[PDB]
């Protein structure tokens, strides 16, 4: 049960992270995948910025939850015409985070449920595997998947992500609430 959510750190440079406390989980995915919307659904409040147009990579944001854990919002990758400077910033921040944040318990990798897994997502998977970073796949935007196509598409994500490694796969919709409570429970378990 999430009681309190506070934005406490906007990290713009490597290593500018708050004290580890009791642990944390992180969220990442392609820009526009629905990360801010998912965070808001999890927090049960509008706090992360939602938009049809993806924001530039600028920071890693730390949300202090119940005064003892963090939900960490990593910047989205790909999509926009990411300039050299922006991708370098992206790489610089996320790599620093992965390599140095020992208290990270789990990364939730958000991917669009509506289409099959894509190359940049698979690259993300390979990278975290190489860094020994645990991760769980979260499918987003499930409310837009035709009921008659849900089975095929879910199997496709399962098949693809099984050729690799993973913690589990949770379909979600920030619109209907599908999977939100299941994701919350898994997080509570990982943290406690």
Ligand X SMILES: Nc1nc2c(ncn2[C@@H]2O[C@H](COP(=O)(O)OP(=O)(O)O)[C@@H](O)[C@H]2O)c(=O)[nH]1
At its nearest, how many Å lie between ligand X and the CB of residue 102?
Answer: 26
Q: Quote the least distance from Cβ 13 to ligand X, whole Å.
A: 22
* 174 is annotated as contributing to ligand binding: yes
Separation between Cα atoms, residue 54 and residue 57, nearest integer Å: 9
SS3 category, 188: helix
Closest distance between ligand X and the C-beta of residue 8, in Å?
A: 19
Q: After which residues is the chain broken (C to N over 2.5 A)?
A: none
Distances (CA, A) of 66 to 25, 95, 181, 189: 14, 27, 17, 15
- Least Cα distance to 41 among 177, 185, 145, 186 occurs for 177
Is there a binding annotation on residue 59? Answer: yes
* 173 annotated to a ligand binding site: yes
- Is 58 labelled as part of a ligand binding site? yes
Nearest residue relative to ligand X (C-beta): 34
Q: Shortest gap between Cβ of 134 and ligand X (angstroms)?
A: 21
Binding site for ligand X (CB under 6 A): 31-37, 50-52, 54, 76, 140-141, 143-144, 173-175
Q: How many helices (H) and strands (E) in the chain? A: 5, 7
CA 45 – CA 100 distance, rounded (Å)? 30
**Residue 53 or 130 having the CB closest to ligand X:** 53
Question: Which residues are known binding-site members?
Answer: 29-36, 55-59, 73-76, 140-143, 172-174
Question: Which residues are known binding-site members for GTP?
Answer: 29-36, 55-59, 73-76, 140-143, 172-174
Question: Which residues are known binding-site members for Mg(2+)?
Answer: 36, 57
């Amino acid at each position: 049960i999430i009681r309190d959510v506070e934005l406490v750190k906007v990290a713009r440079t490597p290593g500018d992270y708050p004290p580890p406390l009791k642990g944390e989980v992180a969220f990442v995915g392609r820009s526009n995948v629905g990360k801010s919307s998912l965070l808001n659904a999890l927090f049960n409040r509008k706090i992360a910025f939602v938009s049809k147009t993806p924001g530039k990579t600028r920071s890693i944001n730390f949300y202090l939850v119940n005064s003892k854990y963090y939900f960490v919002d990593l910047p989205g990758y790909g999509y926009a015409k990411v300039s050299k400077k922006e991708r370098m910033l992206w790489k610089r921040l996320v790599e620093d985070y992965f390599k140095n944040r020992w208290s990270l318990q789990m990364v939730f990798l958000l991917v669009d449920g509506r289409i099959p897994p894509q190359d940049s997502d698979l690259m993300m998977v390979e990278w975290m595997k190489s860094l020994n970073i645990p991760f769980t796949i979260v499918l987003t935007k499930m409310d837009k998947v035709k009921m008659s196509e849900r089975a095929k598409k879910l199997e496709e994500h399962r098949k693809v992500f099984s050729k690799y490694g993973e913690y589990t796969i949770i379909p979600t919709s920030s619109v209907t609430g599908e999977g939100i409570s299941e994701l919350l429970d898994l997080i509570s378990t990982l943290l406690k």
